[PDB]
Ligand binder design. Structure first.
Ligand SMILES: [Cl-]
Ligand SMILES: [Cl-]
Length: 162
């Protein structure tokens, strides 16, 4: 297992514009288009993203292209962030995958708000970080996914994904 397979499990793959768990226009493998309530706004963001007139539909290749860009962007957002970077550097490779998952889902600003959790992760107090991560809107809105990610941070194995 790896970050790409992990995220593919948590996000799914849809080839036509859909609304994510928050109600926002999304396509592909969790690629958020726009928070605007306008489907026309989403269609236009989509055309711009893919570089052609999509009419709200993309191919599998195109979905995987956005996905690659989004994983890369998430990683680069962690490394450029002064609060995320030292935690990520402290982690082993499996738990690094859990951090990228979170940034992918909620953005670098969102994750950098998990100040207490990040400190416990850095000190490698795994059971305590897992308890603190769960006291969150994230965990209450999307518990099955949050549980899988939290378990990954707790154990440093892919057991929640197997
Ligand atoms: Cl894009
Ligand atoms: Cl979920």
């Amino acid at each position: 297992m790896n970050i790409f397979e992990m995220l593919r499990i948590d996000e799914g793959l849809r080839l036509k514009i859909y609304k994510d768990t928050e109600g926002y226009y999304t396509i592909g493998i969790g690629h958020l288009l726009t928070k605007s309530p306008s489907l026309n706004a989403a269609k236009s963001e989509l055309d711009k993203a893919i570089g052609r007139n999509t009419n709200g539909v993309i191919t599998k290749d195109e979905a995987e292209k956005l996905f690659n860009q989004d994983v890369d962007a998430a990683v680069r957002g962690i490394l450029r962030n002064a609060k995320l970077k030292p935690v990520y550097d402290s982690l082993d490779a499996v738990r690094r995958a859990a951090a990228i998952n979170m940034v992918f889902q909620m953005g670098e600003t969102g994750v950098a708000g998990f100040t207490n959790s990040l400190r416990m992760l850095q000190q490698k107090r795994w059971d305590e970080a897992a308890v603190n991560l769960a006291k969150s809107r994230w965990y209450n809105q999307t518990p099955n996914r949050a549980k899988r990610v939290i378990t990954t941070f707790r154990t440093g194995t892919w057991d929640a994904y197997k």
